[PDB]
Amino acid sequence: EDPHLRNRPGKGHNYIDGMTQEDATCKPVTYAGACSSFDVLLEKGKFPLFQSYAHHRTLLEAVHDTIIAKADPPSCDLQSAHGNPCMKEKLVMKTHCPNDYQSAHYLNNDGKMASVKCPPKYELTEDCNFCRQMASLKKGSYPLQDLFCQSSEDDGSKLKTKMKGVCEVGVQALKKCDGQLSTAHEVVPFAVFKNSKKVYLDKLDLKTEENLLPDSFVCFEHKGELKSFDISQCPKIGGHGSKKCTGDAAFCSAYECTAQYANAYCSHANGSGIVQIQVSGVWKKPLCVGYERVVVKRELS
Amino acid sequence: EDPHLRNRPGKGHNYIDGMTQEDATCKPVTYAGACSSFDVLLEKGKFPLFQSYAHHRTLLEAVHDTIIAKADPPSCDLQSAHGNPCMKEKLVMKTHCPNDYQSAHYLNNDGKMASVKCPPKYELTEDCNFCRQMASLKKGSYPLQDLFCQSSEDDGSKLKTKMKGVCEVGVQALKKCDGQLSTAHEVVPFAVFKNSKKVYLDKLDLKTEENLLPDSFVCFEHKGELKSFDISQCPKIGGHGSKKCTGDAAFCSAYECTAQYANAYCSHANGSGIVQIQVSGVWKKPLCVGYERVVVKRELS
Amino acid sequence: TSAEFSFVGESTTMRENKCFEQCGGWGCGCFNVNPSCLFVHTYLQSVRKEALRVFNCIDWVHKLTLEITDFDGSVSTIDLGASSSRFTNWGSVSLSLDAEGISGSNSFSFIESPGKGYAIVDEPFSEIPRQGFLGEIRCNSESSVLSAHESCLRAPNLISYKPMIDQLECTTNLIDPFVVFERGSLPQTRNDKTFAASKGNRGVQAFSKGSVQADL
Amino acid sequence: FNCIDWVHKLTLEITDFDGSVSTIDLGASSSRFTNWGSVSLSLDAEGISGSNSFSFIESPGKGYAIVDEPFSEIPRQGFLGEIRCNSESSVLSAHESCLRAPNLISYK
């Protein structure tokens, strides 16, 4: 019930490495600023999964926190040479990006991250598979997948696509085809672990496991309402600190509370903590679980 | 029908040390004048207990009547960090203070009056927990509770909280708990006897015993529009009295009525008398019973 | 379907949205002491790749497959039963006398299997579905069984749920039609006739004895 | 709760080919999900009928019990199953959403 959808834990950086153009307004990402790579994540009717899970991290924040690696090149330019590795994974995807956007990032196959790049002044289209010519053009990127990042270091490189009766989904060449193969764009779940491939899913069992973590509390600065305030300036239990801080039982159980003798009010975020996954009957912890609309080839005959 | 909301049976002083600014018109409290420390007790949808029973003393009137003592210091400061009586009790408070207010008072554990205030020119917030800046401040304080005091000398200085199944309610530490305690912010009725602590109760029973006390009769002067008049100057059958009064059968049954040869109109103020509550199956007469929203911790094994 | 499962996607499939309540506290995750909720989104999925069309027969029409040869040479193959009519190049044809009919077939249901044989069930036709009876989950076409269309009719509260804190087991008790299909597979000894499949035209027939007495 | 039919459940511990040992169960004509596909029960000629006239009581932590009386549907005064609810919080915390019979509290 807490309307803290703009407060980002950790550091609050959303600009990606490759399109560092909107870094003047999204640093740090807080209640202020009009970052094009975060405004569409909270609009009603776009990515409801991130609307349900918004107190954690994103894919960009995971890249900045040394969680999700970047491919080579991390931002494949669309107007340069003749062939780039960041195209076979883009044409198979079918999304809907609004107008006035230059870049569009997505998830690759090797577990890293690869985005596109268009030289000025090129904008996207209704699908984003190709950047054509020309409000003003946003100097950022549009999230092509409905996923969310989180702090995790669970290893899982010995798992592959767990989909039965599927020929070649996305760009992964699984099993061969001998009869009728479909090609309809359907949603498929996936979950990439640490240093692994784009592992798809079939049965998802999400849950909420909260824990007393420093990156699970939100707060706003008080002054003569929601204001930006760094959480790292909160003293510990009898430790030290620069300014002051206070909160409820969750925020005051681990940090020091001074009641009215502070400048903010730290509150525990609803659902923030540890979000595990149940794949192959074994409870695991993913990194950036989400959905995507790629080309699914199912063997009907 | 609501009784005389302006007449106060007793003292009539509604001012605390440190904010003595409304003593010119709020000393005592009658039909003429106004006071910010008393008009909030009649607002609809907030304090219905005082609206139901208005013929009794409040908190400040009980303090000025040599009944409820004052803490040291009686007026706490909102800037003296690390060193104040109001801290552990104020932290477990969840109230709502209106805007344009500076001071705030409540009932402490020792049965006194521990008020807090900020230096000029500061105001309070919406929840009455922090202190922001700023239109004009009021000349009084806002009570954060809905309690009323009486006049009694009943014994009961060795009685504490008689709640069953509650580990630590508000600030008192009854029984020790180490498991999973409840954190729900509920309302619990409290009561304070003669020289006792804050005794919480789970259930209470009310009653009404009307008498013929001199304070249970008002006086409205005739001029030929009704103005207040001192009822103590009424003629007593066999006692004293200079200014003649008049009224109905209730006024003439104990006093003397002359109508045209009198000076004021008397009437039986309905809704007064001695009100005693049933504490633990025994009808007692406390000195400050009401309601407050504190932290209640119950055993959950 | 609120925001708890709106990100899954729309699909024409007989699905449902449930809601349960487990526990809270710090033993499983949650800052509030109140028990947490448990939203369940269960949808049907046909694990097989074959479909069956269960039908019945209220009367047995004595069909006579006639191969009428035209005058010019256009040989056509038609059929006549009881009092039916067809279309030919020279006009039409109908059946007159037909004193060969068997009554009493409402207490038997038939199952059609594309590719394989047919079957017979010794029970009357199922009209209204209910739990613990043959003919629970039904539809109206082949896509309603293979792709599981949401237009198919079914009984409410047909999916059981056994939550285990962090586990979920949503199973049903649907009767496998292949069990009865393999138990009562044609041919079967019924009274004194032989029931089997038909030739040329898809349908059920019967093998009787005697001669052919009719008027064309 | 009650039991309208006794399903002959067979708890089967299916071992996969790679080594993933899973534990499931099959009853009458049920189906589960395994790593190699699925499994169902065919023949099941073992069932007991006539259990509608008995009600069961579940106790978390302790054992169970049996009552020699049919299931209670509508509540009424002087019968087992008066004040009822829908969840554990409706019994522990006494939720308003629980159904009960009117004029159930006496006054003297």
From TrEMBL, chains A, B:
<comment type="similarity">
    <text>Belongs to the phlebovirus envelope glycoprotein family.</text>
</comment>
<protein>
    <recommendedName>
        <fullName>Envelopment polyprotein</fullName>
    </recommendedName>
</protein>
From TrEMBL, chain C:
<feature type="domain" description="Phlebovirus glycoprotein G2 fusion">
    <location>
        <begin position="1"/>
        <end position="216"/>
    </location>
</feature>
<protein>
    <recommendedName>
        <fullName>Envelopment polyprotein</fullName>
    </recommendedName>
</protein>
<comment type="similarity">
    <text>Belongs to the phlebovirus envelope glycoprotein family.</text>
</comment>
Automatic annotation (TrEMBL), chain D:
<protein>
    <recommendedName>
        <fullName>Envelopment polyprotein</fullName>
    </recommendedName>
</protein>
<comment type="similarity">
    <text>Belongs to the phlebovirus envelope glycoprotein family.</text>
</comment>
